[PDB]
Design a protein around this ligand. Structure first.
Ligand SMILES: Nc1ncnc2c1ncn2[C@@H]1O[C@H](COP(=O)(O)OP(=O)(O)OP(=O)(O)O)[C@@H](O)[C@H]1O
Ligand SMILES: [Mg+2]
Lengths: 86, 201
């Protein structure tokens, strides 16, 4: 219901066949049982790459909280390469 | 337009619709102008939904199933004319589709005794009847499109092609284009085809 949003937030499982493009994912930030950083929504879950992430300074990024994220999904593995975080 | 993909088979069907030019040659011979296509493939690969489309779009089309057909039901049958009293012939599936097309489904499931007759029609394009004092040659100039399945449930790439198809070589030589189609698992293909099917429904 925010004014700015009307890219829109896409469910995670809608990314299972795409090999390109951009997506706006919203979900819990946590660690998988394998020890890798991941994002989770009621639809599903995905692993997250922070190697080249540029966060928006001004707040705290602690596991267990909702995060808006932007990036590109790669189907060679199952990874959402992040480029922005808020 | 409700089938996703299979562009080359759809081109082959169109070339079937516009047949070739038949050449009449000395010694009482004719070079056939019909194009005959066979499709062998995996289960659920839209083989049977193209035969149904050919049935509707073409001017003349006759549908046949392998197990529910007989040799006397494809060429001709001896019957009687009640009104006048003579003995006559009644046309079968092949001869009723003169200058037309015949679409056969489950072609490999046809019995051997049934499969010889179609051989002759595929070769001479004529039927010979010599039964009950009726000696006649009947004209049958039809195009054949057929669909079958391999010997096993699915096509095997680790075995020679002749082992996969149970049909004999003599029958297999009489088809202009043999299309082996396989369903391969790929996420992008699945995402596109599922979207198309869900849009259709
Ligand atoms: N490429 C496709 N596009 C649309 N629908 C398809 C496609 N492939 C398969 N289907 C669907 O699959 C179902 C079964 O297809 P069909 O009956 O044509 O298969 P088949 O090759 O004759 O199978 P079988 O080997 O079991 O005889 C139909 O509902 C059909 O719409
Ligand atoms: Mg079928």
């Amino acid at each position: 219901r925010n004014e700015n949003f009307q890219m829109s937030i896409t469910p995670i499982k809608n990314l299972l066949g795409r090999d390109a493009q951009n997506f706006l994912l919203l979900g819990l930030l946590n660690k998988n049982f394998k020890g890798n950083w991941s994002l989770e929504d009621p639809s599903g879950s995905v692993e997250i790459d922070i190697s080249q992430t540029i966060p928006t300074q001004g707040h705290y990024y602690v596991p267990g909280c909702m995060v808006l994220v932007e990036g590109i999904y790669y189907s060679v593995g199952n990874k959402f390469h992040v480029t922005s975080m808020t | 337009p409700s089938i996703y993909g299979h562009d080359h088979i759809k081109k082959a069907i169109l070339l079937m619709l516009m047949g070739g030019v038949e050449k009449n040659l000395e010694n009482g011979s004719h070079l056939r102008g019909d194009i005959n296509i066979l499709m062998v493939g995996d289960p659920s690969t839209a083989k049977s939904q193209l035969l149904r489309f050919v049935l509707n779009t073409a001017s003349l089309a006759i549908a046949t199933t392998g197990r529910g057909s007989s040799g006397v039901g494809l060429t001709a049958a001896v019957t009687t004319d009640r009104e006048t009293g003579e003995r006559r012939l009644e046309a079968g599936a092949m001869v009723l589709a003169d200058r037309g097309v015949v679409c056969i489904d489950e072609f490999d499931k046809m019995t051997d005794v049934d499969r010889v007759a179609i051989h002759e029609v595929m070769e001479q394009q004529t039927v010979t009847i010599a039964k009950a004092g009726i000696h006649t040659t009947l004209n049958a100039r039809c195009s054949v499109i057929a669909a079958a399945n391999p010997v096993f449930g699915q096509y095997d790439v680790n075995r020679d092609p002749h082992q996969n198809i149970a049909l004999p070589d003599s029958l297999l030589s009489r088809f202009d284009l043999l299309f082996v189609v396989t369903d391969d698992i790929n996420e992008i293909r699945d995402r596109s085809i599922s979207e198309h099917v869900l849009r259709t429904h």
